[PDB]
Curated annotation (Swiss-Prot), chain A:
Assembly: Interacts with REV1. Interacts with PCNA.
The protein's name: DNA polymerase kappa
Entry comment, domain topic: The catalytic core consists of fingers, palm and thumb subdomains, but the fingers and thumb subdomains are much smaller than in high-fidelity polymerases; residues from five sequence motifs of the Y-family cluster around an active site cleft that can accommodate DNA and nucleotide substrates with relaxed geometric constraints, with consequently higher rates of misincorporation and low processivity.
Name of the encoding gene: POLK
Family: Belongs to the DNA polymerase type-Y family.
TM region(s), chain numbering: none
Distribution of this protein across tissues and organs: Detected at low levels in testis, spleen, prostate and ovary. Detected at very low levels in kidney, colon, brain, heart, liver, lung, placenta, pancreas and peripheral blood leukocytes.
Function field: DNA polymerase specifically involved in DNA repair. Plays an important role in translesion synthesis, where the normal high-fidelity DNA polymerases cannot proceed and DNA synthesis stalls. Depending on the context, it inserts the correct base, but causes frequent base transitions, transversions and frameshifts. Lacks 3'-5' proofreading exonuclease activity. Forms a Schiff base with 5'-deoxyribose phosphate at abasic sites, but does not have lyase activity.
Localization annotation: Nucleus
Curated annotation (Swiss-Prot), chain B:
Annotated S-S bridges: none
Function, as annotated: Deoxycytidyl transferase involved in DNA repair. Transfers a dCMP residue from dCTP to the 3'-end of a DNA primer in a template-dependent reaction. May assist in the first step in the bypass of abasic lesions by the insertion of a nucleotide opposite the lesion. Required for normal induction of mutations by physical and chemical agents.
Record comment regarding domains: The C-terminal domain is necessary for protein interactions.
UniProt protein name: DNA repair protein REV1
Lineage: Eukaryota, Metazoa, Chordata, Craniata, Vertebrata
Cell location: Nucleus
Quaternary structure (record): Monomer. Interacts with the DNA polymerase zeta which is composed of REV3L and MAD2L2; the interaction with MAD2L2 is direct and requires that REV3L is in its closed conformation. Interacts with POLH, POLI and POLK. May bind ITGA3. Interacts with FAAP20/C1orf86.
Annotated spans, Protein interaction domain: 4-97
Taxonomy, superkingdom: Eukaryota
Gene: REV1
Family according to the record: Belongs to the DNA polymerase type-Y family.
Provenance organism: Homo sapiens
Tissue and organ distribution: Ubiquitous.
Length: 17, 99
């Protein structure tokens, strides 16, 4: 939902750098 | 949209390994989007000419994907390899023998 089912999408999104 | 070789924003291979291994251990079945991202990463190393890291990533994924033995991971790895092979040929005409 808020993040996709993609692991890397999640990782890129959690890294708000 | 050219970047320096990063996976989920991770440029350092140590951090990349951390991501790959976590992915392959926590995720039982890879999503096409993740697979394509690995794809885009491998081809990215090619363009940025850092075949050193590419070689290391390939072998690292081999270790993880084949330790999980399942066809989804095995096929995934081969799929990634294909990209690498073809793209290396497009660019340099020189491939890496992946065994």
């Amino acid at each position: 939902g808020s993040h996709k089912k993609s692991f890397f999408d999640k990782k890129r999104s959690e890294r708000k750098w | 949209g050219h970047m320096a070789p990063n996976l989920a924003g991770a440029v350092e291979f140590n951090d990349v390994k951390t991501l790959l291994r976590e992915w392959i251990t926590t995720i039982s079945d890879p999503m096409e989007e993740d697979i394509l991202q690995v794809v885009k990463y491998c081809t990215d190393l090619i363009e940025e000419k850092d075949l050193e890291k590419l070689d290391l990533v390939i072998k690292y994924m081999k270790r993880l994907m084949q330790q999980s033995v399942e066809s989804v991971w095995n096929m995934a790895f081969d799929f990634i390899l294909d990209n690498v092979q073809v793209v290396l040929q497009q660019t340099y005409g020189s491939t890496l023998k992946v065994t």
